[PDB]
Amino acid sequence: TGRMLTLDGNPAANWLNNARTKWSASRADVVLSYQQNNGGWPKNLDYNSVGNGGGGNESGTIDNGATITEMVFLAEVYKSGGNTKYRDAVRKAANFLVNSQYSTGALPQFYPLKGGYSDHATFNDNGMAYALTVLDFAANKRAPFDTDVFSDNDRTRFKTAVTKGTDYILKAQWKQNGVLTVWCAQHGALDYQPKKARAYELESLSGSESVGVLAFLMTQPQTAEIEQAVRAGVAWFNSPRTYLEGYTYDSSLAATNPIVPRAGSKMWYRFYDLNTNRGFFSDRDGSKFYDITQMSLERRTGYSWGGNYGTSIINFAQKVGYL
């Protein structure tokens, strides 16, 4: 309606609403106990298995759902139970995210900056896209942030951060021989270029992370340029030059080859070549190759090299008429 798309079925919104009750509410004190003084969480943790934390002075991170998940969860616990220590934790977390943001809008994996690939704009593990989703829900007074947790001035700051992040995403979207496509799992914070991360994470279009970036963009006012960018990304996911036809990724078969023939099924690669759009593989030696059986056993079983990534964004695009 107008230039706003529904949030019903939006993958980023679904992640956020699920995060509100990710753990038992009785785990709130254990979650709180790991928050660093800068407002971020230090690592991804399983709060159903760990003991009490002891705070700390290390860098915060958005690796593997950290910080963004905890802050949404604690905002909901505050909404439901009224204990202001949780409100205060959420305030520190939102400030952490904004403090981490580069002038260009990029969000790093770790902050304060640790050097290496963690400094890059990090789409990996839905980090930057879902962090911007959290800030956008906060900016727009959406539950669980419709309590007294934030002021009007806070929301103005968050809207600015979301706008900068959107600008970053639009500038980083990869032009493949003149055609707008999608994003690498990480890009240069200042130069917008695709970057490597770990040895086996090469410069590429990301089949895994580009879904969440498109979902975040679909939460925003659909300007002419944003509509074009989203339609381009969806068209890339829905192209026979991108998906593998009559295949699925079965991780139970990873001992030799998880990419297997299957009727009525499409598969997306985790990594595509920036220029040729060929699905590819890597390994701990940083090599680039096209036959997954050439990979070390530990990397083929220890990391997913493809999946059903496109399904959720293509179905959502169909729902809202973006095909």
Side-chain angles (χ1 to χ4, degrees), residues 29-30 33-34 50-54:
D29 277 351
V30 57
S33 75
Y34 285 91
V50 297
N52 238 73

Side-chain angles (χ1 to χ4, degrees), residues 16-245:
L16 189 152
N17 285 308
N18 178 262
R20 295 166 71 177
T21 58
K22 178 122 197 141
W23 305 281
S24 168
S26 72
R27 300 296 184 190
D29 277 351
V30 57
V31 170
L32 178 58
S33 75
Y34 285 91
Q35 189 177 31
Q36 306 300 276
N37 294 323
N38 60 32
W41 275 257
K43 77 174 276 171
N44 62 300
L45 289 185
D46 175 11
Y47 297 108
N48 293 319
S49 279
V50 297
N52 238 73
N57 294 288
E58 297 292 340
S59 290
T61 187
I62 61 176
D63 186 27
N64 254 296
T67 302
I68 58 171
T69 307
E70 290 87 342
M71 71 188 289
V72 174
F73 171 72
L74 291 182
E76 175 73 15
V77 172
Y78 176 58
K79 183 176 172 70
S80 81
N83 192 331
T84 58
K85 74 184 187 177
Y86 302 130
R87 180 194 68 186
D88 294 349
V90 174
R91 292 170 174 182
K92 293 186 82 171
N95 184 235
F96 168 82
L97 291 176
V98 175
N99 286 340
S100 78
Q101 190 174 45
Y102 292 88
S103 68
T104 58
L107 298 179
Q109 194 188 224
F110 282 80
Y111 188 78
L113 300 176
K114 295 177 59 181
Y117 73 82
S118 313
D119 290 1
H120 295 322
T122 297
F123 298 114
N124 198 63
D125 297 337
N126 292 314
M128 179 167 171
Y130 289 8
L132 295 171
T133 299
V134 170
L135 292 171
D136 182 69
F137 272 54
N140 284 289
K141 230 184 312 269
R142 298 192 187 108
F145 307 111
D146 59 342
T147 60
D148 64 355
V149 58
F150 298 125
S151 73
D152 288 347
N153 200 66
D154 292 339
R155 287 185 278 275
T156 294
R157 289 220 328 153
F158 302 153
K159 182 173 181 183
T160 293
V162 170
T163 305
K164 290 166 61 177
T166 296
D167 186 72
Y168 183 90
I169 287 167
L170 295 171
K171 286 179 159 70
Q173 195 171 5
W174 179 253
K175 292 168 197 179
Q176 187 177 74
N177 307 309
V179 183
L180 270 184
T181 58
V182 296
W183 298 265
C184 192
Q186 54 287 316
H187 286 248
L190 303 181
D191 70 18
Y192 303 95
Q193 301 171 0
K195 305 291 176 188
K196 308 184 197 287
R198 298 175 286 189
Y200 45 88
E201 293 169 331
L202 307 185
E203 307 93 327
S204 52
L205 301 176
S206 180
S208 48
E209 310 301 352
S210 291
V211 177
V213 178
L214 290 164
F216 164 73
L217 289 172
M218 294 172 84
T219 71
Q220 296 302 290
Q222 293 298 287
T223 68
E225 182 185 356
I226 290 175
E227 177 172 6
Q228 159 192 336
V230 174
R231 287 178 178 279
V234 168
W236 178 89
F237 269 106
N238 203 217
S239 176
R241 80 198 184 78
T242 298
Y243 58 73
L244 211 58
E245 305 190 68

